[PDB]
Amino acid sequence: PRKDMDILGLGMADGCELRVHPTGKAVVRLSVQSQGQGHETTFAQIVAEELGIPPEDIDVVHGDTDQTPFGLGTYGSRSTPVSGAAAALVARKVRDKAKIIAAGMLEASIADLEWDKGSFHIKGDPSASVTIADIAMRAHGAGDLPEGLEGGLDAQICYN
Amino acid sequence: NDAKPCGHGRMLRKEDPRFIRGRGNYVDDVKLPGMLHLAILRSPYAHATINSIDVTAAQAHPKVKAVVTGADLAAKGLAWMPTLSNDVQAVLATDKVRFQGQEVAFVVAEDRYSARDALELIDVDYEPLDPVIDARHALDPGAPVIRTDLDGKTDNHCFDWETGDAAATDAVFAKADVVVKQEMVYPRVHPAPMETCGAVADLDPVTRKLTLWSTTQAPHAHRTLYALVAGLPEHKIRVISPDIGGGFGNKVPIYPGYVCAIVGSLLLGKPVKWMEDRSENLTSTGFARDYIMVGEIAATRDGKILAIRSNVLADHGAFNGTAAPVKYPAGFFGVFTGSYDIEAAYCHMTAVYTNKAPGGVAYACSFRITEAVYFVERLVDCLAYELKMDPAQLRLQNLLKAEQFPYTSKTGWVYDSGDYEKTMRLAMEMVDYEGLRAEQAEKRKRGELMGIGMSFFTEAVGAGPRKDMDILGLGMADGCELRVHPTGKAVVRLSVQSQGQGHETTFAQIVAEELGIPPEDIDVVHGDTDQTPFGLGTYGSRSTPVSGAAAALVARKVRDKAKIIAAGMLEASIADLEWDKGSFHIKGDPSASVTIADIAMRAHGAGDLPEGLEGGLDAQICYNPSNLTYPYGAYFCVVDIDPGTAVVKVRRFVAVDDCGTRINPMIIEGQIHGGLVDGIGMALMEMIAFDEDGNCLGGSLMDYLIPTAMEVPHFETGHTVTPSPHHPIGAKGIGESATVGSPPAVVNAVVDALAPYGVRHADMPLTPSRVWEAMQGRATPPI
Amino acid sequence: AVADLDPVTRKLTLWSTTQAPHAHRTLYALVAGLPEHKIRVISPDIGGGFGNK
Amino acid sequence: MQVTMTVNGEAVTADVEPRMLLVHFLRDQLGLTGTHWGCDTSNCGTCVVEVDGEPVKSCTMLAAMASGHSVNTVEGMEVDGKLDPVQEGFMQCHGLQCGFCTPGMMITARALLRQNPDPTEEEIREAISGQICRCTGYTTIVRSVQWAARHAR
Amino acid sequence: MQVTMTVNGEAVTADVEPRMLLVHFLRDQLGLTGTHWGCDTSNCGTCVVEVDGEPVKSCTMLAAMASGHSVNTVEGMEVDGKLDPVQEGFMQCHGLQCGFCTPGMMITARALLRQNPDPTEEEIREAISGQICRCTGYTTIVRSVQWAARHAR
Amino acid sequence: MQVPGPFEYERATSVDHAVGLLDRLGEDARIVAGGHSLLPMMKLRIANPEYLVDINDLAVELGYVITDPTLVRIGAMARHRQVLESDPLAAVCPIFRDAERVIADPVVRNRGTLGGSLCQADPAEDLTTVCTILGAVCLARGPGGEREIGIDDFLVGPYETALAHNEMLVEVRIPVRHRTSSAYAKVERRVGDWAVTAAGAQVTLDGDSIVAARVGLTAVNPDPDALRALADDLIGKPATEETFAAAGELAVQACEPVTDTRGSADYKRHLARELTIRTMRTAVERVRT
Ligand SMILES: Cc1cc2nc3c(=O)[nH]c(=O)nc-3n(C[C@H](O)[C@H](O)[C@H](O)COP(=O)(O)OP(=O)(O)OC[C@H]3O[C@@H](n4cnc5c(N)ncnc54)[C@H](O)[C@@H]3O)c2cc1C
Ligand SMILES: Nc1ccn([C@@H]2O[C@H](COP(=O)(O)OP(=O)(O)OC[C@H]3Oc4nc5nc(N)nc(O)c5nc4C(S)=C3S)[C@@H](O)[C@H]2O)c(=O)n1
Ligand SMILES: Nc1ccn([C@@H]2O[C@H](COP(=O)(O)OP(=O)(O)OC[C@H]3Oc4nc5nc(N)nc(O)c5nc4C(S)=C3S)[C@@H](O)[C@H]2O)c(=O)n1
Ligand code: FES
Ligand code: FES
Ligand code: FES
């Protein structure tokens, strides 16, 4: 918690960015830096769990401060408690937005949408389903998105 | 220019320090370990079946690492690739070559020199076919069918497009006092950036990550298209658009050479550099223009323009490669009604295939707006000629009024804002229109040919609302990310890609304006898709209307969040905080202030942030334009024509541009000036001509004549500020404005100079020979 | 650490065996006075850290 | 073949094919990527370098021909961390946008200013008339050269 | 001094100082950065390469001494796009984390499996006992080597 | 970029060394001077010499511009820049300055050479016309020795000269006469572009009559017989506008221009006339000043 834990005045809360490309591949940018702990796999798995994008389709980016969000790095076994939590939450943010877009695409109320590991379908008809890749394309695609929604299927979080 | 404003205004460009030292990083500068060099064997024929391709001798070259033909690509399913217009286009010619200079094979070799040698070694057996070079006879019965690749295609018809109301226009013309018909050609020209197209494709054989250094104006679009076309995973594609040596629309398309470099890297597991030579560039990448436009303008005898009708035959080359939004196959040509209040307008356009390189949307055309503006301004000068009325007076009486905006044009375009009369009068005063007329009359007394040409044009730039404008299904909304570092320095990541337009400065200025961080403290990141948000790239002057708006809005998001954090820090209500250019202070106590840097540190710092607020000072946005921006211009060209040699010299060019709020006047001036040089080049000398056999006569800078510093005057520019209401900072695009408006100004000037010879119209290029022929009463289009 | 302070752009690209590249970038900005937006700390593959980095 | 020449004041010796154009020897062999190329027909002037003090299209000179000669490029223009007045004028006057022509343009402008301390706009236009700039419109380049001339004075 | 040796099956000749350690000649001179170094006292084993078919600490061999010998590194282990069974076993069994010792470890494991098709865990541990892995705990390395051994069979 | 095919390179240390290299190397050896005609051709692979004999080291021995009272001698290695900049040459043969100012661009002028332009013998190019107008005598040197070829003899066809494969142009000798001047006028689509059509004229004035005249046409395929007929017809005429107009009409008849990207054949003929008139008037005004 930043209220208690800071390194030289830097609160120990971790940023994480998630971006679903139009073709449905994703990139998660971490503030943690692996020195062999497998972040490039595990954070792919955290996001994959939340979003239904296969881990092989999730590029985990880390260590380059020019293309990664600010965070306190890897020490104190904090990568999974802090950056892992952030990654899960940002994937969930992307899933919530994707739900909005998918409800638009299914011409359905957002309430009638059920999430099914990678896809939103109208409750009842699994067949009226759209994958996160379809939603990603739509989020970058032609035609108005749901009112008040920005395009792109990107989210960022600073997890404290 | 050496001022240091915190925001909009003149300031030195942040790209200059490296460019002036030769430290730009252009694609051909990219040297990677083990890099191989790719050269593409081009078709010598405009239209020929490929009987067979023998690559044994080229393969046997000791320095040649691979020889790839269209058959090899077709095996990999890459012999064809979608064009931006949803057509397909040969990556390498397989069945036939549909234009001279078209890609037939490629050789990967140890170095560029050996690669070219090897190309010489390749033997291709052609069966030449009759070329379709004259777009007027492309649709003639019995014309050879270019697009035999298409199932059931029996003619060279590309598409039919129309805008406006045919019946309303016909009725107005029936009732019109004066109907002026003029055929005018907008000859095929080329963007011809000094840096040719190129790509260093390094498909890392182990990680399978494709890193593609490319001369692309739309690296993200390109990345997505590569993922779609080559099947490559998009998250394993990093398109790096480095410093680009000028794009001018030339680097919007994905060219076959980029695909060929990717394939070479895939095949060889080595970086492969393909840098096109000038001849390949001129003959195979995207041409621009190439319209044949019959305009009819119906007016009252007093000069009230009533209706405008356009019949366009568009020459689209072998494939429809036009880089246009999907719903706008003819691009924004519908703005051919121009800046004028007319009752009705109708345009019908026929796009035909010819045995020439694809393209058409390029060279600062703003999606065919160059064609529409030349069409209408030339047609209005024809109408003035017929009415024997001063073209400036004609225009001024027909121009849309400020109170008419937002104006819905007769072709459905909603012009955002504009005070056209003010800008036009400004241009006339600056050029001293009446004094120029007196001098021209005196010169005509003396027999000398002085032309005063003018254009008033409305641009439509900033594509665009995703509901309407998408490129191959990609909505034309731009992402922008802003991140304030703990120490208060910022990084803005753009989805636009500069090719010299100064984005690294102007976007710093937009953010600086919103946030109070000095531009020098704002790193503008662009061109590298691995660290930039998705966006449609830089073309159609859209960077400032779309990405500029996005940048302003994301800076404002960061400012709002910073206000929350600052209110926490000042132990004050958010309502009691006043923003003061870089700082929040409690109302009435400026000393109780915190800078954006303090807030940035706090946002990353110790102690709880305000409840419900996430740390950091990052924000992002995907800006979807409500409407295009409609900058406008009043351009006045003064030319002298030598009556003996018919050599045209542009003596003066006053360009008055209104692009709304001006981020950087020095950059804006540069953009205009470059556009003016383009217009002079098109009006006077530039043309890619083809002989009857289909040989491209403009395959080199010897034959495609680009203006030198000696062909162009010391440009003069003025401006008015009519902000775009729907833009967060009221800025409209400017990049292509001068290129759009200047050609009709220069042609009008030349035609006006030719007035003593009874010339109502002469077609560009207005070369000495063509101008002299116009003098002889034998004015003919170059096509 | 491979420190490449580009003499022209003044951008510091610091390949470093750092477990906290962002913390390090901010600390470098604070300590050397370098502008943080012109500091790119690249923590490449790290051969084991164990806190040492 | 062996070629020896002074590049930006440093002696350099290399094994080059006789056919190697100087622009490619500078850019690809010597990594002096400041010098550009943009045409096949010696038309664009983006390759202009200073051979024996004179602007030369390095695309129209073989490295073998440059052997025994001093070749100066834009890289050598900034001396002891000090921008040449041409470089500073180009920055100050927006004499470049994409920067591709700029190396050649500044080499030509520096040569001109050496031979002509106070060039007129026409003399600048003429001096650069062999070098194409697609971006600037050339007016800012004339202004840049005037700025360099006036500051050198 | 001139040294000539076969590195990953390719003949290589270079001018090296007599004092140049082989690890540095491979990494720096030949750019074969798969080989690592982690100590001054020939203790860590991260530089282990194959010299004449035997694991050798390249940090404790001069390039000049390797002259006339065949030197194989981790880079040469994947042949014709196919991972050596040691490499595949290391991936499958999580025999690496940071990957620093892996090159050496896999060179040693490949040499062992060549001389011993079916090693015991004790034999594997002894064979790698000169190579430090800080990350894995060595159990996954033993599992990786057993996996490679059993798949080679 | 388009790059040359492989070739062998030789650097001539003297005129005799260059001539010997051409003799030993043979027909497939070519001199390279400024390379601004050869090198573009080889880059386009139009020209594929096996050997280039670089004579740039002869730029000092053969790069002179010498103006004696009765003779201008211009070395083959004379840069276009040197010829353009030679003020004494401009006093004696202003045509050279006229053409140079409109030849290529300053950078090309720094390298291209009079000898290179002449031996290129490109009918679309200006110096062959200028050296034909001035009655130049080319001085060739080969293994056989040194010899003099009249410019008309030297220019035997498009891209062909009287020079043997083993022979090199050393200098061009142009007679100087009193009351004589010359002018060149070129129409190009763009600065640095090859002549749409160019005309040059050298005239001698005795009082107000014409004692001697030569008119050359560039890029219009002049007929040397018709041009000589025009020149002979100019003899003894007054240096007036009527004479210039008649010469322009003859020049119209003296060429066979081809309609191409540079312009219509009719426009080329109109330019033949108008540029002939302009150059004749300029040459006369130069004689009278
Ligand atoms: C962009 C551009 C624009 C141009 N515009 C014009 C123009 O407007 N008008 C115009 O007239 N020209 C023009 N030129 C051509 C220019 O004038 C010539 O290319 C140049 O003068 C040739 O001279 P050089 O020394 O470079 O010849 P090289 O290329 O070195 O030689 C040309 C030919 O002559 C031979 N040769 C050269 N020197 C000798 C010698 N001493 N003895 C025997 N043979 C010799 C060579 O072997 C070769 O066959 C232009 C060229 C370029 C690149
Ligand atoms: N109200 C405004 C509008 C623009 N600008 C500044 O002017 C530049 C041009 O902005 P914009 O109009 O958005 O155009 P783009 O940046 O989208 O550039 C594209 C435009 O740019 C043109 N000019 C070019 N200039 C250069 N050097 N290189 C190109 O490739 C160019 N390509 C052409 C072509 S073609 C087109 S589409 C940006 O720095 C911008 O901030 C400003 O200060 N105020
Ligand atoms: N419930 C959990 C927790 C963690 N993991 C996975 O285990 C790994 C370790 O996660 P975590 O515990 O978050 O620790 P860090 O990644 O932050 O690693 C730091 C920790 O890592 C340790 N192990 C190391 N291992 C290697 N190879 N190299 C180091 O430098 C190491 N440094 C040490 C030291 S010291 C410390 S602080 C991550 O892939 C993670 O997703 C998991 O699958 N499930
Ligand atoms: S590369 Fe164009 S003139 Fe040299
Ligand atoms: S600055 Fe772009 S070509 Fe000159
Ligand atoms: S580097 Fe440690 S054993 Fe060789």
Ligand code: FES
């Ligand atoms: S895997 Fe890290 S030292 Fe062995």
